[PDB]
From a paper:
Purified mature, infectious MLV particles from the culture medium of transfected HEK293T cells were inactivated and subjected to cryo-ET, and 134 mature viruses were identified in 65 tomograms. We applied subtomogram averaging to obtain a density map of the CA hexamer in the core of the mature virions at 7.2-Å resolution. As previously described for HIV-1, the mature MLV CA lattice is thinner than the immature Gag shell, consisting of a single layer including CA-NTD and CA-CTD. The hexamer–hexamer spacing in the middle of the mature CA layer was 10.0 ± 0.4 nm, consistent with previous measurements from HIV-1 (28), and larger than that in the immature virus. The CA-CTD interacts at the twofold axes via helix 9 (black arrow), as seen in other retroviruses, but also via interactions between K201 in helix 310b and D171 in the loop between helices 8 and 9 (black arrowhead). As for HIV-1, in mature MLV, there is a CA-CTD–CA-NTD interface. This involves helix 4 and helix 8 (asterisk). The observed density extends beyond the C terminus of the truncated protein used for crystallography in a short rod-shaped density toward the center of the core (red arrowhead). This density would accommodate an α-helix corresponding approximately to residues P222–R230 of the CAH. Three of these short helices cluster around the threefold symmetry axis, bringing their C-terminal ends toward one another (red arrowhead, triangle).
Residue numbers in the entry:
A (entry chain B), B (entry chain A), C (entry chain C): 1 to 236
Write the structure that this text describes.
């Protein structure tokens, strides 16, 4: 890790093994649920400002051999040339994301910039390695459970988009797409009412969740329903 | 109708009733399939350069009383103020889309500009009146038939988006949304292969149609299949 | 451990015993799987910049008496003279990799260089001690499992090369050799297709893995197969 010392100079210290093992033990494996470790590592990359060697310990400790490999190749595939486009030119790929220890000096602006880029590419690698073979059926299979809140259902639906499509459900250009899945795959009472909303085209994903919550939050308690039935007094 | 005369001056002539009645008789009613008459009228608005009175004959002849009313209110709802935003200010609405004969003189740039705008708003009115209550189930219900070509299926899917959602399936921002429905609702053999395409995220709607056609075009003729079976020679 | 202090001077602190014991407890023994501890120690040698005494604690804590001995003799066997060749000259061997505490002063370039070399030789020792009696049958016995991904299979195949041959499967000169084992020992459907690839000679190990993944990723789901069978409608 690196931190700005009291003297205005970066200061280095190695990761405590307790932190590394705690991070490992409190999360699923990367393969089981890539989002978990990816989010943890994204955070650490910022708070701990790891050097290249530190990143090797992170990866080496939190990922299996096969996972790390996937991530590293994905990171190298994320390198861009000075024209902002992908590049497979060995020297450019090696310079951005070296597989062997680089001579980066954190006391230099040059070293720092490489470290920044390296960390950014590492994150990209994990994000992309966390992707699986596109399978739209998995997205269509996310249906709101009878007790499931609209916001909880939406999070599961977004997770399926992330895992099983190339589309980022948080992109502004995907909003109507996620919105349509949300409406279609909500519980039937909710979906029928969302479909009938006035100025439906104008509803954001957040609007739709709030409208679904109004219906859900109108759940009509089991006790209440039973009481009504009892007071039914209509016989056959 | 108006046309540029041989002397560089606009020339007026009334619609032949044969054209009006032919247009009516060769198309479904607006209610049955709004796209038909809307496209015909959009074309005529250009080729025939109708005046306000001509537009009344068009509407009066091709639409029922109830359809025309819907269209006219939809057209007035499409009027924009000078700030490009909707306006319900009577004077602005009346000036753009008058319900009673205006004093527009086609020999004046002023008259011509009003005519242009009027025609544009009329078209907008028809496009919007042609919309129905949002019903996502209708879009999910468009499934490729066993003999249906991928391009024919895509056109039916787009028609459902137009009729039963507020989303324009031709908008660039809707492409991934339409693409996902196209993949999910294609015939199962096709959908499974489209889902497995390399660099799926990179495929346009046109790309997906071409890939689906390759599979469809690999239909494996009934005769061929039967022949194979005959030459099976595998008994039980 | 050593680290560059805020004053530009190396600073020493002893290993926390919690780190040493955590490293031990979270890994297999060296004998069980040498790669585990070797990779951990390679990392620590960099991040913790251990002195000669620190290295004795590392080895003493993570290895058994018999393992440490193997490693130390292997490290001394890795010493090179100034002509880049092996040397068994006592003074040269002792100077590079001393068995008794040396007078290396980390505040001197002389001391630092010896420390660098010592750590490099220690790593070499572990890498070589981790080797076992050459046994090609073990490499031929690595066969892809029916559920095993091509990348997971390749990692197991490389592990067998490391453990049971003198060849480094990551060497550029071994690529065709590993490639041929990969093709021959892949699952039969995959191997038959890899063998038929156009311009096979041009395929890297990475290319072959990607081609095998396309076949594997075409696994034809059990459910799918069953469905097909049901819809078979061919009786006997």
């Amino acid at each position: 890790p690196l931190r700005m010392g009291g003297n205005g100079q970066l200061q280095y210290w190695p990761f405590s093994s307790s932190d590394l093992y705690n991070w490992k033990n409190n999360n699923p494996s990367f393969s089981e649920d890539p989002g978990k470790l990816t989010a943890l590592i994204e955070s650490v990359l910022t708070t701990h400002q790891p050097t290249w060697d530190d990143c090797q310990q992170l990866l080496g400790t939190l990922l299996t051999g096969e996972e790390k490999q996937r991530v590293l190749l994905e990171a190298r595939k994320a390198v861009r040339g000075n024209d902002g486009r992908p590049t497979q030119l060995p020297n450019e790929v090696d310079a951005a994301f070296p597989l062997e220890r680089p001579d980066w000096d954190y006391t230099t602006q040059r070293g720092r910039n490489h470290l920044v880029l390296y960390r950014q590419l590492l994150l990209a690698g994990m994000q992309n390695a966390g992707r699986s073979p596109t399978n739209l059926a998995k997205v269509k299979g996310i249906t709101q459970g009878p007790n499931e809140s609209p916001s909880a259902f939406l999070e599961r639906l977004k997770e399926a988009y992330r895992r099983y499509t190339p589309y980022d459900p948080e992109d502004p250009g995907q909003e109507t797409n996620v919105s349509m899945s949300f409406i279609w795959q909500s519980a039937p009472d909710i979906g029928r009412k969302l479909e009938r909303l006035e100025d439906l085209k104008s509803k954001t994903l957040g609007d739709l969740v709030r409208e679904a919550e109004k219906i859900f939050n109108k759940r009509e308690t089991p006790e209440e329903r039973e009481e009504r039935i009892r007071r039914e007094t209509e016989e056959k």
